[PDB]
Amino acid sequence: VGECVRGRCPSGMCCSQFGYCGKGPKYCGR
């Protein structure tokens, strides 16, 4: 996604280390 809701996303999608989001290791990793 564009950027999280200040480090929260819906349906437990992970805010990446980059402050973007999506429900997987692409974001959630590291």
Separation CA 19–CA 24 (nearest Å): 13
CA distances for 10 relative to 13, 17, angstroms: 6, 16
Q: Which residues of 1-30 are buried (b: 16+ CB within 10 A; e: fewer)?
A: eeebeeeebeeebbbbeeebbeeeeebeee
This entry's atomic model was obtained through NMR
